[PDB]
């Protein structure tokens, strides 16, 4: 019918019992469907990005590579990123959830989603985490649109997939509003660990520290997804708000369902919980775009639907 | 707000074992790990080791491996510190402290330290 | 081990003029470094982490900055409340290590 969704305080967290109750009290807040651990925590880092002097050599190009490029480093980072006076668990490899196989049929999205290893999702995966490849390509739009329906579909597209965020934060159309796409790096975890948690927030605040935010970061929310029967210049400045979180509301219905097909993974039953979003903010400049120009500079082999 | 209140001055005899405290205010310690910190006149300060009371798992310095035992308990909200084998050499002050942050690591909140003195 | 070294033991300074206090650690440490202050009668106290970013409540006056192996912690204007010791700690492998400590005077 629809995704309903249950929040709980990220203070003392701990998965409900299974069947430690036959019978859940009569006046019990939570919902009949909060029973068993989750099939997944979803940790989604914002990265937004700004290029602060702009000027008129700015291209549709630029907006695009000068925010993805820090995007091989960032999921290095994170995956390598090791907490250094750990009680409990040291590294993602730990608690992250693993996958081995996409769906047989799916040899097309082969090399495009990630396979024998953890479950972490990014822009750089059209490139397969080779920044020697993002370099290479000709064309960034062109590869990152190759697979995008000419017509809506009920599943969501690689796109969306890879980039976590809505089709609004993206696309061609920000560089004449002089903003800048924003991604999202999402990591899929097993297993819940506060500690590691806590610890690659505050690491990736202090390597990207993200002025004016004050995000609550005070909830976590999980969602269940029943069965389906049917028989002058003047940048805009990186602003941190109230939107900014809870920003996997606004994705597709079929966003998290369509991911975990993938992979035989399957949602009917169980939910999944979404963590709290971790802001990552990243200071461009031109230079970096003007000195990275490179020939076929405004043609792309991709036109968005204008009519 | 947050404070870290240790016990008094301590001196005993060489050869035996004392039980440094530290109680916690304004805080919980299952919400963070509580370090000790040993300074001498001439030595600067030393890091003993660490405990994480929600779990108790404790690690040390390779200096203090036989000698110190950080032990801290949830219900009276505080830590303590125990060293054996005392010797002339064990004479310091001995500091409490915790840290909030878990990429960073640095010492948030100290206590005043208690001084240990250790002569026949 | 990772050795930090406070190079100046006392660091004579007057009223108003600016201090700067500078260690070196023995490798790399990637920027972990945490600045401390002793008042003289004990009580330590937190003035900047990672290498520059000044704890909440700590005056605008302390700023630090360095990378690699070398860093160093400077006052804007001192204060007759800023006389104390100041110690650097490096928290990049997990055996914490301290400096030496620099300790300030009034110039006579």
């Known amino acids: 019918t629809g995704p309903v969704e249950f929040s709980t305080p990220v203070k003392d967290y701990s998965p409900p019992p299974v069947d430690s109750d036959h019978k859940q009290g009569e006046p019990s807040e939570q919902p009949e469907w909060y029973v068993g651990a989750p099939v997944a925590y979803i940790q989604q880092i914002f990265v937004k990005s700004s290029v602060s002097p702009w000027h008129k050599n700015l291209l549709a190009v630029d907006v695009f590579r000068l925010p993805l490029s820090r995007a091989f480093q960032l999921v290095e980072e994170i995956r390598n990123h090791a907490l250094r006076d750990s009680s409990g668990v040291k590294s993602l490899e730990e608690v992250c959830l693993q996958v081995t196989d996409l769906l047989p049929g799916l040899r097309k999205l082969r090399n495009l989603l990630p396979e024998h290893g953890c479950l972490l999702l990014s822009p750089g995966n059209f490139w397969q985490n080779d920044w020697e490849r993002f370099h290479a390509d000709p064309d960034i739009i062109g590869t990152i649109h190759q697979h995008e329906p000419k017509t809506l579909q009920t599943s969501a597209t690689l796109k969306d997939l890879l980039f976590g965020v809505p089709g609004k934060y993206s696309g061609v159309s920000l560089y004449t509003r002089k903003r800048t796409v924003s991604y999202t790096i999402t990591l899929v975890f097993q297993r819940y660990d506060s500690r590691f948690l806590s610890s690659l927030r505050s690491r990736l605040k202090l390597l990207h520290p993200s002025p004016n935010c004050s995000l609550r970061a005070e909830n976590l929310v999980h969602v269940h997804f029943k069965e389906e029967i049917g028989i002058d210049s003047r940048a805009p400045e990186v602003t941190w708000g109230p939107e900014d979180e809870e920003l996997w509301r606004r994705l597709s219905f079929r966003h998290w369902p369509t991911l975990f097909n993938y992979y035989n993974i399957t949602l009917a039953k169980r939910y999944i919980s979404l963590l709290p979003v971790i802001p990552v903010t990243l200071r461009l400049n031109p230079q970096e775009a003007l000195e990275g120009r490179q020939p076929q500079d405004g043609r792309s082999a991709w036109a968005p639907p204008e009519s | 707000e947050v404070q870290l209140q240790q016990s008094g001055a301590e001196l005993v005899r060489p050869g035996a074992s004392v039980k440094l405290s530290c109680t916690a205010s304004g805080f919980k310690i299952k919400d963070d790990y509580i370090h000790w910190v040993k300074q001498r006149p001439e030595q600067g300060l030393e890091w003993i080791g660490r405990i994480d009371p929600a779990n108790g798992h404790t690690r040390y310095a390779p200096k203090f491996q036989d000698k110190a035992t950080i032990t801290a308990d949830t219900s009276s909200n505080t830590a303590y510190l125990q060293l054996s084998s005392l010797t002339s050499e064990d004479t310091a002050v001995y500091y409490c402290?915790?840290?909030?942050?878990?990429?960073?690591?640095?010492?948030?909140?100290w206590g005043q330290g208690t001084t240990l003195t250790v002569s026949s | 081990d990772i050795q930090m070294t406070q190079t100046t033991s006392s660091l004579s300074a007057s009223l108003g003029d600016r201090v700067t206090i500078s260690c070196r650690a023995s490798?790399?440490?990637?920027?972990?470094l945490n600045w401390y202050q002793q008042k003289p009668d004990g009580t330590v106290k937190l003035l900047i982490y990672?290498?520059?970013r000044l704890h909440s409540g700590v005056p605008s006056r302390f700023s630090g900055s360095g990378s690699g192996t070398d860093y160093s912690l400077t006052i804007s204007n001192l204060e007759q409340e800023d006389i104390a010791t100041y110690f650097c700690q490096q928290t990049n492998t997990l055996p914490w290590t301290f400096g030496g400590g620099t300790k300030l005077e009034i110039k006579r």
């Open positions: 402290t915790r840290y909030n942050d878990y990429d960073a690591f640095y010492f948030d909140y």
């Open positions: 990672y290498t520059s």
């Open positions: 490798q790399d440490i990637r920027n972990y």
